Ligand binder design. Structure first.
Ligand SMILES: *[C@@H]1O[C@H](CO)[C@@H](O[C@@H]2O[C@H](CO)[C@@H](O)[C@H](O)[C@H]2NC(C)=O)[C@H](O)[C@H]1NC(C)=O
Ligand SMILES: *[C@@H]1O[C@H](CO)[C@@H](O)[C@H](O)[C@H]1NC(C)=O
Ligand SMILES: *[C@@H]1O[C@H](CO)[C@@H](O)[C@H](O)[C@H]1NC(C)=O
Ligand SMILES: *[C@@H]1O[C@H](CO)[C@@H](O)[C@H](O)[C@H]1NC(C)=O
Lengths: 216, 531
């Protein structure tokens, strides 16, 4: 159930006297819960344990740092939305243009969050858009939808090397690095219909969440 | 003793760009000012003529042609409309080397004398080199003025010009100081070696005129190796003696610029000195070294970190473009695809949005690097370039200036050492840490038989509380000049009993390796002040 005042995450504190490869304990793991305010929410501008952007009371998205091998640190990108705020309306003839953000990380740098701009456009159930980096205008990803599922989107990369990544990728719509996108239509608390779009996707090379919002 | 005996062995000259700024028409390469190509001049200037009768677009073009062909001396400014020559003559002199100084201007047909009041050994040197005496002048004299002549010229020369036409001439009146005299330097008249200083070119001058701030040598060799300045001369931090009038006059005369900090007649000929200063303002200016216990963001935008796997093996220094400076032993070619570059971050476990990561494309390790003595422990890291980007840019990183001479900083200068090194009791440090250290004049006592002064540099704290530990290798040893510009003086090479007093950290003297880096990265990317 949605609770922006208590959201699950992990607080990872490093081992103060951790030796260099002498022991496998280098950080300590505990369960923590946070209350989110409007806008981006984080603790330390130098060592953030969590980034979360509260677009509206009905939805938030972000990531929390997590580990599985107790020796390497990875980012777990997640999103949540109010169940009653999700819109189940028909959209086969729905037209709009959407703006938002796309956070992701790569396999070689799992702990480094990477920002990207996302542009979305719906015309009569047909979806198209483009993804750009923060500081430069390179085409990173392509939004192309399914004719019988506006709620579902396939995403494929268009560059050999993602920002903050050393892993080589395959380009083209036939690339094996595609992944599916589940889009949730969110109505804002003020009564605007389908005000925000959220969704998360993951490959073994990269994983992230899509944070999207209605412009017109 | 105002003269530094140690520096004199280096026989620095006016062309030594490690000790004096090059002229606008030269370039500093392998520690020597090399003359630019006439093409290389800035296109803004005034047309001039040489004694050979050819016109040149700018004064610096003529100076470069001078630097290749000595016989092509500057004659007059403007177009070569008139054919009037520029000659100097000596009269009323027992020996052809001596006599009253008389100058015939290019635009004036009457030979007439020069005033004695504004007459110095610099103008005498210029006059003698103009007459053909390569070794310049010997002394100066003021004789009585001709009662039949009431007009004379006051002349001002920088001291490096090849002819008086490059000097400035002003209208003057015969005053009580009379007219100027000169005796050109000759081997027979050279002073005894006992009480004489030896110029690089062989000229002998009295010891009292060495390191006096006055350019008494032909090539300035008497004013580049000094412990203190005699009389009114101003002493640079780098041991250069400069006259007082060059202080607070608007151009950098000392290498570190301390001469310009804390600063609040009818023209017979054009001011070629004003042209030279004006030309200096058009050389490209490099923007580096300026910024917009644990540290914070932006305190070290030049701080680079190389990661091997999940551990930061060593630190690094950003230099510009896709180039990073790091100790040679910190990297190996065989692990080419494993290194990662991390920037603009404080915690490696918790990087922020501002943190970006780049791959390594090429690594250059110095050829003469020795793995046993740690000599020449420098490596250059070439960051992987974005294929669709014409130029490698890091939006959130500011490169730090690389020193071009080993004389930028002196012993006991305050410098900053930083890195991710080990804490006390070998505790793991997960945040960028920075400390202050002081440079040491001597270090051979602490490390006899292993310390090399030309290549290795020793610094540390008196109490030893703050010191670079293991893992600080590749870390910066940065210093700030009088202008608050950050220079990367050294990179962490090795340390014995890190954190203990009397065992200072040892850092490779990066300034000694400016030529190697510049030849590997492109000189114009990292060079300032035509160097
Ligand atoms: C690295 O430096 C060491 C120390 O000088 C060199 O080893 C000695 O080099 C001298 C040079 O004349 C020889 O006379 C000795 O016989 C060497 N001794 C040993 C044990 O090697 C070493 O050669 C240098 N190596 C490189 C690659 O520069
Ligand atoms: C040099 O002259 C050109 C010609 O118009 C002018 O555009 C430029 O500003 C000048 N540069 C300097 C440094 O005077
Ligand atoms: C520097 O150390 C060496 C070590 O042998 C010594 O010979 C020399 O005199 C020292 N110079 C000083 C202290 O100025
Ligand atoms: C840095 O700037 C401050 C500004 O007043 C100045 O006081 C200080 O001396 C400068 N640092 C150096 C090393 O000159």
């Amino acid at each position: 159930s949605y609770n922006k005042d208590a959201v699950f995450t992990y607080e990872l504190i490093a081992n103060p006297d951790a030796d260099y490869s002498d022991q496998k304990l280098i950080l300590k793991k505990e369960i923590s819960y946070i209350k989110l305010n409007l806008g981006i929410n984080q603790d330390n501008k130098n060592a953030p344990s969590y980034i979360f952007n509260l677009l509206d009371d009905n939805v938030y998205y972000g990531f929390y740092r997590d580990t599985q091998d107790m020796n390497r640190i990875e980012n777990k990108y997640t999103y949540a939305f109010k169940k009653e705020a999700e819109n189940f309306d028909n959209l086969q003839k729905f037209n709009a243009t959407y703006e938002g953000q796309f956070w992701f990380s790569s396999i070689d740098t799992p702990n480094v969050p990477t920002v990207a701009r996302a542009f979305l456009t719906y015309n009569n159930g047909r979806v198209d858009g483009e993804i750009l980096a923060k500081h430069w205008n390179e085409k990173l990803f392509q939004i192309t939808g399914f004719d019988n599922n506006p709620r579902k989107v396939e995403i494929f990369p268009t560059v050999e090397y993602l920002p903050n990544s050393g892993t080589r990728l395959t380009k083209g719509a036939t690339s094996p690095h595609r992944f599916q996108m589940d889009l949730h239509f969110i109505n804002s608390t003020n009564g605007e219909k389908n005000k925000y779009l959220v969704g998360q996707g993951s490959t073994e090379q990269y994983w992230g969440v899509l944070g999207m919002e209605k412009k017109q | 003793d105002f003269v530094d005996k140690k520096c004199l062995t280096e026989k620095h000259t006016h062309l030594s760009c490690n000790k004096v700024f090059c002229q606008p028409w030269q370039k500093c390469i392998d520690g020597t000012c090399l003359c630019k190509l006439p093409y290389q001049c800035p296109k803004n200037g005034t047309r001039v003529c040489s004694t050979n009768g050819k016109s040149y677009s700018t004064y610096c073009q003529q100076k470069s042609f001078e630097c290749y062909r000595p016989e092509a001396k500057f004659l007059k400014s403007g177009a070569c409309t008139g054919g009037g020559q520029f000659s100097v003559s000596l009269s009323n002199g027992k020996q052809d080397s001596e006599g009253i100084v008389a100058v015939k201007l290019a635009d004036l047909d009457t030979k007439m004398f020069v005033c004695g009041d504004s007459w110095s050994i610099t103008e005498a040197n210029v006059a003698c080199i103009d007459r053909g005496f390569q070794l310049g002048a010997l002394d100066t004299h003021r004789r009585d003025p001709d009662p039949n002549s009431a007009e004379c010229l006051h002349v001002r020369c920088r001291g490096l010009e090849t002819s008086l036409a490059e000097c400035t001439f002003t209208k003057g009146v015969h005053n009580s100081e009379g007219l100027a005299g000169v005796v050109c330097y000759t081997e027979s008249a050279a002073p005894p070696k006992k009480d004489s200083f030896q110029c690089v070119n062989g000229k002998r001058i009295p010891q009292k005129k060495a390191c006096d701030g006055v350019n008494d040598c032909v090539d300035k060799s008497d004013e580049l190796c000094c412990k203190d300045c005699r009389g009114e001369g101003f002493l640079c931090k780098s041991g250069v003696c400069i006259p007082k009038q060059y202080k607070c006059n608007g151009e950098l005369d000392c290498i570190t610029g301390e001469d310009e900090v804390g600063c609040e007649a009818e023209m017979l000929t054009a001011d070629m000195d004003a042209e030279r200063k004006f030309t200096k303002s058009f050389l490209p200016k490099l923007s580096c070294g300026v910024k917009n216990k644990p540290a914070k963001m932006g305190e070290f935008p030049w701080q680079m970190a190389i990661k091997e796997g999940d551990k930061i093996h060593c630190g690094g220094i950003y230099i510009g473009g896709c180039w990073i400076l790091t100790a040679a032993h910190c990297v190996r070619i065989s692990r080419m695809h494993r290194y990662q570059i991390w920037t603009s971050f404080t915690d490696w476990l918790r990087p922020g949005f501002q943190t970006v990561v780049h791959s390594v494309n090429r690594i250059i390790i110095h050829e003469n690097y020795n793995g046993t003595t740690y000599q020449n422990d420098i490596a250059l890291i070439e960051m992987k370039k974005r294929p669709n980007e014409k130029e490698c840019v890091l939006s959130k990183s500011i490169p730090a200036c690389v020193p071009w001479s080993p004389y930028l900083f002196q012993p006991n200068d305050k410098c900053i050492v930083s890195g991710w090194g080990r804490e006390k009791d070998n505790q793991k440090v997960y945040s960028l840490r920075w400390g202050e250290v002081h440079l040491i004049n001597n270090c051979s006592e602490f490390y006899p038989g292993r310390y090399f002064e030309k290549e290795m540099q020793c610094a540390g704290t008196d109490d030893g509380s703050i010191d670079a530990c293991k893992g600080d290798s590749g870390g910066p040893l940065v210093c700030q000049d009088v202008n608050n510009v950050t220079y990367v003086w050294g990179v962490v090479s090795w340390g014995e009993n890190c954190g203990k007093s009397e065992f200072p950290g040892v850092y490779t003297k990066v300034a000694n390796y400016f030529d190697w880096i510049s030849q590997h990265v492109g000189r114009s990317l990292i060079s300032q002040h035509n160097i």
